[PDB]
């Protein structure tokens, strides 16, 4: 894995970084990237290799000022995944919602500075997750990742995540899959490598900050 | 095109389908299959060629007796798309929710004769659409398209939807694709023809229904 200031710094870059949660909670990786520019390019790219379910974390400091209400009272999620209602961008640019460009758009508008609630129309196609206000240490989860990543590196606190799938191999003329399934461990390194992308470990994020706040 | 008829008769079968709405609506078209036997290898495919934002289209009726409320009570996107809040199977199989195996599972038991409330957990992965009750003549949409065809092939009343995406050109070593954007008009056709799937219009299936019904 790569050292959390190397993933920082590549961050703080605009770059995605590939970040594992631990084996006994999801045992998968995500791609985070900082929200403020993504591009179309780059957001194409994640969903080609992701899951295709963008996410947008971002704190309760945001979640009030854009007036973005948890998607439902009563949580059923195991983790308590936050989602709060989905959205598009409230932009002449935005046709359907759905594509790159349009999701890419989505996530730099809910980290612009001067975002506001009406920036945004409800429902739409990118998903924006509530961290919780302790961070990493108090829950390990991708969300909460990314959040601490954009405070690491100085960027507006909203990023931008998905899992990295297995999507297995095309099986020539028929639409299937074959052997499909999420990336794990080794796999996700050989990923990072793969696209010149920095690497790590949620675990290694709790150290990194402990050694400034202690153990929760 | 192919004939409604063909494309009926190919959703019979646990085939997609590709449907493009009308130019001047989205321009899009949706890979589209019967809910019931979606597989898990073919979860796979979608997930591969399409946005990944994995959607259920079902009637009002099923919306109702499973217990799926409408994600926002102020619905503010452009056509009224009817999201449910998202679901996850409660099933022992399933483990995070997002994986190919998961999605195809939750959509099978969202079609399931039996399903019941319970069998559902709030919010979670995949995202039911609740068509119209008047069907592809009253809303020219791939949520009506989907019900409509499970009810031509005497299916059970959810299918499962995703917009096929242009997902541009890798980029050599680089987290990036080039030139992406949404498939369109011949573009969806060649798609169909190179995967061995049935394509058509809406316009063309709302004159299949009319057949039967008159215009509405
Ligand atoms: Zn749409
Ligand atoms: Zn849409
Ligand atoms: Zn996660
Ligand atoms: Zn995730
Ligand atoms: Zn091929
Ligand atoms: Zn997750
Ligand atoms: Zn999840
Ligand atoms: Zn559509
Ligand atoms: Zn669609
Ligand atoms: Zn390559």
């Given at each position: 894995?790569?050292?959390?200031p190397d993933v920082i710094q590549a961050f703080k870059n605009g770059e995605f970084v590939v970040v594992l949660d631990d084996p006994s909670r999801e045992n998968?990786?995500?791609?985070?990237?900082?929200?403020?520019?993504?591009?179309?390019?780059?957001?194409?790219?994640?969903?080609?290799?992701?899951?295709?379910?963008?996410?947008?974390?971002?704190?309760?400091?945001?979640?009030?000022?854009?007036?973005?209400?948890?998607?439902?009272?009563?949580?059923?999620?195991?983790?308590?995944?936050?989602?709060?209602?989905?959205?598009?961008?409230?932009?002449?640019?935005?046709?359907?919602?759905?594509?790159?460009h349009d999701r890419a758009l989505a996530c730099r508008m809910l980290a612009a500075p001067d975002a506001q609630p009406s920036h945004f129309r409800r429902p739409?196609?990118?998903?924006?997750?509530?961290?919780?206000?302790?961070?990493?240490?108090?829950?390990?989860?991708?969300?909460?990742?990314?959040?601490?990543?954009?405070?690491?590196?100085?960027?507006?606190?909203?990023?931008?995540?998905?899992?990295?799938?297995?999507?297995?191999?095309?099986?020539?003329?028929?639409?299937?899959?074959?052997?499909?399934?999420?990336?794990?461990?080794?796999?996700?390194?050989?990923?990072?490598?793969?696209?010149?992308?920095?690497?790590?470990?949620?675990?290694?994020?709790?150290?990194?900050?402990?050694?400034?706040?202690?153990?929760?």
């Open positions: 894995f790569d050292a959390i998968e990786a995500d791609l985070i990237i900082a929200a403020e520019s993504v591009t179309t390019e780059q957001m194409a790219f994640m969903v080609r290799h992701s899951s295709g379910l963008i996410c947008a974390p971002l704190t309760p400091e945001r979640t009030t000022a854009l007036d973005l209400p948890q998607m439902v009272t009563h949580n059923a999620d195991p983790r308590g995944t936050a989602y709060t209602v989905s959205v598009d961008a409230e932009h002449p640019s935005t046709t359907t919602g759905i594509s790159a739409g196609h990118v998903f924006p997750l509530r961290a919780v206000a302790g961070g990493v240490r108090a829950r390990r989860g991708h969300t909460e990742a990314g959040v601490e990543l954009c405070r690491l590196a100085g960027k507006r606190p909203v990023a931008v995540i998905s899992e990295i799938v297995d999507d297995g191999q095309e099986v020539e003329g028929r639409a299937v899959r074959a052997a499909p399934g999420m990336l794990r461990g080794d796999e996700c390194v050989a990923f990072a490598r793969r696209w010149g992308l920095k690497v790590c470990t949620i675990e290694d994020m709790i150290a990194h900050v402990e050694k400034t706040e202690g153990k929760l």
